[PDB]
Design a binder for these strands. Structure first.
Lengths: 106, 213, 129, 329, 27, 51, 30, 229
RNA sequence: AUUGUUGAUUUUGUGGGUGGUGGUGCAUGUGAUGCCCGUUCUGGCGCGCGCUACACUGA
């Protein structure tokens, strides 16, 4: 009667980097919702954190979540490459003067 | 017959449009509006949210145009937010457009009476109770109160007795405008209702209850 | 347990339904056994949780508000237990002093002539100096 | 001192009277602690007179009084942490009463009452109540909290817990109440108690310091008179009245069986079936919510509908080009 | 034990209408 | 929701049925009859569906 | 007036006119 | 004995759209609506504000009243039947323009702000929410019968027609179907605007009624008929 | 004390009454009338072509 699953239940919602991420979404595209986190950046962060991209955001265990937070907050420490991370009015006035000059000729 | 405040025996259906926001202001006197006059109402120091005489106009259009009023079983009263009580003749055919209505009310508030050539609209002396029928049920429209079927409510009501409703013409406010006059407050629907809808609902129920058709 | 829909009254229900509902009310008896030791046999699922309703009248304002949650829709997925477990009478008093919102102290317009009873108005009948 | 320092006579007198309001309160409680059985009549003349004065100050200086009241509640708590009941004195019982006089008890939240009501409830639950003095002290507390809720009529679980053990304390167990935890089995009343004489139910405060059977019975009658009041005012309204009263029915049933001549439990008892008979104990229905309407979103539009500069610069070049080309041709 | 489980539930927790005659906002 | 897929073809969904709002723990095809599918849910009703 | 204010305060009106529910923000968290 | 729903949190019922044809609903068509604009800026023409312009156009100013459709929309959209998500409204302008009204719209209460909305709609062909997550008023393609439900009952509000109880009429009507009422927002005219679509015409009251009253009187029967309350 | 030298005119603390060179009508100005509730400057496109999208026959 007493069965307790070690990994834990499915998390419908999670809080990462002061952002709410839906559990139903995949890990990469759920992390994309964080500002400053793009598709490729989230994919790379998951690859560094060693999290299977096929999992759902809710499926993530705890230690993977702290690992993702740590990679994101200190990208250089884990070798994330650096590359990854009036005059016009004067022209307009000249144009208006020229247009007035043409109107003068015609 | 045209029901009038003097008659107290006939069973009728009185509607009191409480907290009606009708006022005149001169920079010339003109009915105040939430949109036409915004700065002016700021100068008077009031909120522009509760500056809406259109609510009182829409209620009158639906009340006067209802089949019951055509049957001579309804008379309306307006309790202005300032405490000015106005009696509306059931026979009146108020202007349909609002601008012509605003011109009519501003004539009313100064001349204190509109006459045709019976006063179609006449300012009267408060309290409302003196004018209401001697035997009458008083209720208010409350969202928090229990919901009731208007057809059943009027049916279980007596025959010699009449029904008063104090519909709140304010945009927003506490439903305590008519608390001291009234004996109970009743809810009419689970969803919050506009003033025009509420009196139209309570109008439709009376017509089914009394077989006005 | 928090609510039995069969006992709710609908304004559209017919007079016979009203009569049927009334009879159902008269015959109800709480089946929860407090002495049964088997949790699978206590018939609790057929009972109702009147006790949590009474807690909505608890003297402490914040405990009453928590109890009121059962009257509100169950939007929250779960409640963090760790934020409610280790509370004491001392913590409640300390939390009361360190209140974010500060209010004005009120006074009683009703007047009592004597605080204690004798051995016009007495605040504590049954107690004497 | 009040007359010599009215606000008008000089600047700063409001603050001086403000501090004197706090100082006066500490005097009212201080005198009650001092022994006064010798001259109870004289003490009764001064103590209530000072309270009447304190009420006038509170009308003008409630804020200064409120701060002193909250400090004392902290002081009682602090002394209770180290000494438990030994800290508690008659001054605290008087103090809790004055607060009811001067402040509105029937508020959901109050600066002074809510700490007081939490602190009072702590005593009714934490204190051991293993002596007649200790029970008499608790009997006063039940009366104070009952008067606090004389209008609000809120539910205090500690009062239920207090009544159970005190009723069971004087019957010691009968082996039928194992769920109630007693703190002293040597306070049981003897079987020879008459329970027909007219014994005063009032508890004088000066008697507590002195604190045998007659005192035990008088304390018991006071507790039950509070129990009768709580049933008829507070518990009857609660949906769980049957659950709240069920342990108390058994305890009061024991009193009648053990003492047939004793009438107070029977009057409380006979009242109780009368309430349970009338009250309809139906399943509760709390999750019935009003239907939620479809959303409502306001329209986006322009008030005066019309069917950065680098774009405008390019726009003007197009017209100037067209004129030039026609001119050149 | 409180600190250990206090850490876990942080990720579990999730931080964070016209009616009647209300007129749409003015501007 | 009870979902029916073609074996070895995860992409296409032949049939999707919403048995109940409560969890559906058991979904078993009838052995003798291929057309009918059985579903048992926490609703405590074991509906017998047909594809 | 005093009677009405007492009834309002009895029902949760808190004078600084907030409500009791307002005081219940952050109370249990810390 | 029946087990309760898993989630009892009240949910807003679905907003009806012309795409969905299965659900039973209330369609109300405000035929012969007078909505037309003109450069002065563009202004929704009125019978009172602009009398010369409509004379220049040669069109009669008796039939130049958009305030009727304003009044009919407020009573329809504020009705409880709309709140239950069982009513969707269409408007057929006299010029031949069909407008689909989202049940979720909150049209301005004052007529002056209503007129500014219609010129936006009649030119931009749509109106978007302030938060911009749906279209509240979109001009759609004629005829109306295409947008109506596949099983639907059509009728017009004719004074001359036999008087019926809106309550009895909806109750005797089937359950998979739905009902259209072609209300004439015109002040005066022959009740043949919707003859080609409808199958019959019914009267609701022996006395003459305003358009706002006629539609409000019809829906209140539907609410009591469907127990909307 | 205070003014701008002046002399109790003010200032400070504590209470505290006031809608009033207010309007608008009514009754032979008057009415314990009904009814409600400023000052001076400083600024103010129409008609036409072509292409891309609005996804699962897809990314």
């Amino acid at each position: 009667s007493l069965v307790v699953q070690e990994q834990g239940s499915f998390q419908h919602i999670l809080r990462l980097l002061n952002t709410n991420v839906d559990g139903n979404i995949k890990i990469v595209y759920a992390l994309t919702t964080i500002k400053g986190v793009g598709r490729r950046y989230s994919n790379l962060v998951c690859k560094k954190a060693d999290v299977d991209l096929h999992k759902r955001a809710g499926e993530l265990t705890q230690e993977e979540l702290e690992r993702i937070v740590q990679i994101m907050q200190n990208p250089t420490h884990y070798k994330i490459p650096a590359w990854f991370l009036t005059l016009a009015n004067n022209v307009e006035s000249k144009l208006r003067d020229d247009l007035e000059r043409l109107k003068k000729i015609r | 017959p045209v029901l009038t405040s003097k008659d107290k025996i006939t069973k009728r259906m009185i509607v009191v449009l409480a907290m009606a926001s009708l006022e005149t202001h001169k920079i010339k006197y003109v009915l105040l509006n939430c949109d036409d006059h915004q700065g002016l109402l700021k100068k008077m120091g009031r909120d522009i949210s509760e500056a809406r005489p259109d609510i009182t106009h829409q209620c009158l259009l639906t009340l006067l145009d209802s089949p019951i009023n055509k049957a001579g079983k309804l008379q309306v009263y307006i309790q202005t937010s300032r405490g000015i009580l106005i009696e509306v003749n059931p026979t009146v055919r108020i202007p349909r457009t609002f601008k012509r209505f605003s011109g009519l009310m501003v004539q009313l508030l100064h001349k204190l009476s509109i006459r045709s050539v019976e006063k179609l609209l006449k300012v009267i002396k408060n309290p409302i109770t003196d004018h209401l029928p001697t035997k009458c049920r008083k209720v208010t429209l409350s969202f928090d109160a229990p919901v009731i079927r208007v057809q059943d409510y009027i049916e279980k009501l007596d025959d010699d007795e009449s029904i008063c409703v104090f519909v709140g013409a304010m945009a927003r406010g506490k439903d305590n405008f008519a608390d001291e006059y009234v004996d109970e407050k009743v809810g009419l629907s689970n969803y919050p209702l506009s003033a025009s809808v509420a009196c139209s609902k309570f109008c439709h129920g009376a017509e089914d209850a009394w077989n006005i058709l | 347990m928090l609510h039995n829909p069969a006992f709710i009254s609908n304004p559209f229900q017919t007079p016979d339904q009203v009569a049927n509902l009334k009879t159902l009310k008269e015959n109800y008896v709480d089946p929860f056994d407090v002495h049964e030791s088997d949790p699978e046999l206590t018939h609790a699922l057929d009972s109702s949780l009147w006790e949590l309703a009474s807690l909505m009248e608890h003297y402490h304002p914040n405990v009453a508000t928590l109890a009121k949650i059962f009257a509100q829709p169950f939007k929250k997925l779960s409640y963090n237990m760790e934020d409610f477990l280790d509370w004491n009478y001392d913590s409640l008093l300390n939390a009361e002093s360190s209140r974010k919102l500060k209010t004005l102290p009120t006074l009683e317009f009703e007047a009592f002539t004597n605080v204690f009873d004798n051995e016009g108005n007495v605040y504590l009948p049954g107690v004497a100096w | 001192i009040i007359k010599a320092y009215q606000p008008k006579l000089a600047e700063g007198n409001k603050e001086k009277l403000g501090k004197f309001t706090a100082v006066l309160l500490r005097h009212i409680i201080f005198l009650s602690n001092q022994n006064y059985l010798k001259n109870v009549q004289s003490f009764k003349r001064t103590q209530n007179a000072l309270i009447s004065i304190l009420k006038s100050l509170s009308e003008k200086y409630n804020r200064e009084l409120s701060e002193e009241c909250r400090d004392y509640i902290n002081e009682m708590q602090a002394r209770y942490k180290k000494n438990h009941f030994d800290a508690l004195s008659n001054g605290d019982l008087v103090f809790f009463s004055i607060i009811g006089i001067l402040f509105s008890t029937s508020d959901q939240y109050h600066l002074v009452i809510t700490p007081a009501l939490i602190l009072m409830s702590q005593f009714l639950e934490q204190i051991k109540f293993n002596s007649l003095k200790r029970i008499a002290f608790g009997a006063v507390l039940v009366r104070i909290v009952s008067q606090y809720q004389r209008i609000s009529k809120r539910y205090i679980p500690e009062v239920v817990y207090f009544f159970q053990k005190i009723l069971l304390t004087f019957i010691v167990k009968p082996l039928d109440f194992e769920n109630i935890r007693l703190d002293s089995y040597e306070l049981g009343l003897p079987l020879d108690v008459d329970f027909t004489k007219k014994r005063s139910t009032i508890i004088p405060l000066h008697t507590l310091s002195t604190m045998p059977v007659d005192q035990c019975v008088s304390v018991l009658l006071n507790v039950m008179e509070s129990l009768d009041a709580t049933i008829s005012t507070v518990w009857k309204s609660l949906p769980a009245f049957n659950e709240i009263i069920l342990p108390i029915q058994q305890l009061l049933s024991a009193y009648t069986s053990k003492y047939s001549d004793f009438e107070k439990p029977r009057n409380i008892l006979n009242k109780v079936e009368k309430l349970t008979k009338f009250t309809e104990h139906i399943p509760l229905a709390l999750q019935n919510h009003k239907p939620v309407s479809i959303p409502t979103h306001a329209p986006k539009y322009e008030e005066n509908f019309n069917p950065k500069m680098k774009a405008q610069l390019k726009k003007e070049r197009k017209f100037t080009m067209k004129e030039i080309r026609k001119d050149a041709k | 034990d409180k600190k250990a489980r206090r850490r876990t539930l942080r990720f579990y927790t999730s931080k964070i209408r016209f009616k009647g005659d209300d007129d749409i906002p003015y501007k | 929701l009870v979902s029916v897929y073609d074996s070895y073809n995860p992409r296409t969904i032949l049939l999707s049925i919403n048995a109940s709002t409560h969890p559906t723990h058991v979904t078993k095809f009838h052995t003798q009859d291929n057309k009918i599918l059985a579903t048992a849910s926490d609703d405590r009703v074991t509906r017998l569906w047909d594809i | 007036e005093l009677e009405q204010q007492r009834l309002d305060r009895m029902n949760g009106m808190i004078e600084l006119e907030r409500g009791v529910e307002d005081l219940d923000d952050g109370f249990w968290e810390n």
